[PDB]
Amino acid sequence: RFVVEKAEQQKKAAIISAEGDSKAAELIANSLATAGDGLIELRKLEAAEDIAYQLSRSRNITYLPAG
Amino acid sequence: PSITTEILKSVVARFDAGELITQRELVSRQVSDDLTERAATFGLILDDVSLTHLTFGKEFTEAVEAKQVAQQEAERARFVVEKAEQQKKAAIISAEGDSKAAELIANSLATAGDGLIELRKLEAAEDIAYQLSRSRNITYLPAG
Amino acid sequence: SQLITQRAQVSLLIRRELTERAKDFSLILDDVAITELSFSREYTAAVEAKQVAQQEAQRAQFLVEKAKQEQRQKIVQAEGEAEAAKMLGEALSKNPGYIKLRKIRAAQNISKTIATSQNRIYLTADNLVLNLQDESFTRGSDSLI
Amino acid sequence: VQAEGEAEAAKMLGEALSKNPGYIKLRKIRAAQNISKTIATSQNRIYLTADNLVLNLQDESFTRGSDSLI
Amino acid sequence: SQLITQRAQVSLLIRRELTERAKDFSLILDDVAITELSFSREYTAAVEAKQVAQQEAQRAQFLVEKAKQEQRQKI
Numbered sequence: 001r002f003v004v005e006k007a008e009q010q011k012k013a014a015i016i017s018a019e020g021d022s023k024a025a026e027l028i029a030n031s032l033a034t035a036g037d038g039l040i041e042l043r044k045l046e047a048a049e050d051i052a053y054q055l056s057r058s059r060n061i062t063y064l065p066a067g
Numbered sequence: 068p069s070i071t072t073e074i075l076k077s078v079v080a081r082f083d084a085g086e087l088i089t090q091r092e093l094v095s096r097q098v099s100d101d102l103t104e105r106a107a108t109f110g111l112i113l114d115d116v117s118l119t120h121l122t123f124g125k126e127f128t129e130a131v132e133a134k135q136v137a138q139q140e141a142e143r144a145r146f147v148v149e150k151a152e153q154q155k156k157a158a159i160i161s162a163e164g165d166s167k168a169a170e171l172i173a174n175s176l177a178t179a180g181d182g183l184i185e186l187r188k189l190e191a192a193e194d195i196a197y198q199l200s201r202s203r204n205i206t207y208l209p210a211g
Numbered sequence: 212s213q214l215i216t217q218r219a220q221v222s223l224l225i226r227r228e229l230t231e232r233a234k235d236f237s238l239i240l241d242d243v244a245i246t247e248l249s250f251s252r253e254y255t256a257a258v259e260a261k262q263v264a265q266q267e268a269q270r271a272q273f274l275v276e277k278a279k280q281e282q283r284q285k286i287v288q289a290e291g292e293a294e295a296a297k298m299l300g301e302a303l304s305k306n307p308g309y310i311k312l313r314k315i316r317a318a319q320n321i322s323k324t325i326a327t328s329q330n331r332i333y334l335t336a337d338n339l340v341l342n343l344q345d346e347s348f349t350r351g352s353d354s355l356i
Numbered sequence: 357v358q359a360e361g362e363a364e365a366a367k368m369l370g371e372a373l374s375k376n377p378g379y380i381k382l383r384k385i386r387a388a389q390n391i392s393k394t395i396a397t398s399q400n401r402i403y404l405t406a407d408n409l410v411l412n413l414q415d416e417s418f419t420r421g422s423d424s425l426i
Numbered sequence: 427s428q429l430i431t432q433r434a435q436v437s438l439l440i441r442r443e444l445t446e447r448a449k450d451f452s453l454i455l456d457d458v459a460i461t462e463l464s465f466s467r468e469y470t471a472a473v474e475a476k477q478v479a480q481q482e483a484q485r486a487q488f489l490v491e492k493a494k495q496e497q498r499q500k501i
Binding site for chain 4 (some may be wrong): 004007008010011012013014017018019020022023024025026028029030031032033035036038039040041043044045047048050051052054055057058060061062063064065066
């Protein structure tokens with residue numbers, strides 16, 4: 001029964017996060033429908049740089065050639 | 068032993084840890100009066116009766132820590148949101164810089180082909196081949 | 212539950228029972244009291260689990276507030292991203308060459324970080340543009356006309 | 357209870373993503389960054405693809421993204 | 427928070443309490459002083475994290491100017 005109460009609180013805290021994500025998506029969609037998805041390409045390049053840096057110290061990560 | 072144990076157990080079984088902590092005066096008065104009454108039968112005056120060492124279980128300590136960290140997290144997040152606002156400002160600024168750069172290059176490239184891209188590709192190939200020319204863990208396998 | 216919560220009543224009941232029982236044995240019981248009570252580890256585990264379940268059902272109350280703050284931060288960051296998208300997608304409306312130039316610069320930066328890395332990279336020799344007879348040699352230039 | 361929460365979330369989120377689902381792509385990029393962060397300290401044996409390094413500038417797929425942006 | 431920020435109030439209150447309590451025992455309490463106070467490492471971690479939050483809100487203020495300069499470089 002107390003676990004059910006916990007699940008009720010978790011449902012509340014998940015609806016809240018869903019509202020946050022929905023607001024973010026609303027803003028970004030309103031922007032991108034009019035503008036176009038170039039920001040996504042720029043973020044792709046920035047994330048490629050950032051990930052290549054993040055994995056630059058692990059010794060168990062290997063980069064095999066494409067295909 | 069018997070009187071002390073019985074008095075303490077009877078006093079504490081009335082309430083719980085939260086109630087014990089919240090009202091120290093109540094528990095102190097209860098223990099003092101009960102011990103004095105019990106020792107009246109046995110004729111031993113209690114010059115001073117004082118409980119002075121409280122220690123709870125790890126469960127209630129964890130609960131208290133959660134309660135405190137709730138308010139502490141509220142206080143710290145009140146500034147974390149400000150930090151996120153500043154980061155949003157510093158990201159709009161970088162976006163403006165990148166957008167202006169893109170505007171310049173697009174204006175200069177729409178009218179004048181895109182040979183610069185090819186030249187920069189060759190220059191970057193040279194530069195990268197130099198940069199990776201010292202690492203011993205980089206290998207160049209043939210195309211396909 | 213009744214015994215612990217009403218330990219005093221059981222204590223006085225057993226006091227009366229013991230004094231009346233031992234009375235026939237010519238033994239006066241000056242004082243009868245309970246000194247210890249213990250159960251099997253499973254019952255204590257169950258009660259501890261009840262307490263921890265109550266504690267977690269309380270902790271959810273702070274999880275929800277943490278979710279509220281995270282929602283606010285997410286909305287702030289998304290506002291930033293949306294404004295950046297509207298101010299930068301208009302530039303690339305005409306010709307997105309800047310993306311290709313940025314990609315080249317990102318390749319150079321990734322090379323710089325990789326050179327000192329600890330991974331085991333296996334690039335492709337085509338990166339060295341050494342094969343000058345491959346029929347892909349003129350692809351880039353051929354694309355300019 | 358959990359399904360009630362999920363359905364209520366889905367309503368609003370789908371209404372938001374009705375127009376243009378760019379937020380999904382941006383979230384995917386952020387999730388890639390987070391996965392990289394967690395992997396960097398992991399004990400697994402990862403074998404990525406050198407294409408992740410966008411170092412092959414001469415490949416025919418280099419201009420793919422920009423081509424999709426027209 | 428109140429105990430520390432109002433340490434003087436609690437200190438003098440405990441001083442008066444000790445004086446009154448020990449008066450019956452024929453002991454004159456010249457002065458009562460709190461020579462030290464400490465908490466669990468978790469509470470101190472929380473206050474350190476509060477200072478971290480404030481200094482992060484400052485580091486962001488510096489990062490925005492750094493971003494301005496980086497924008498100029500990009501332009």
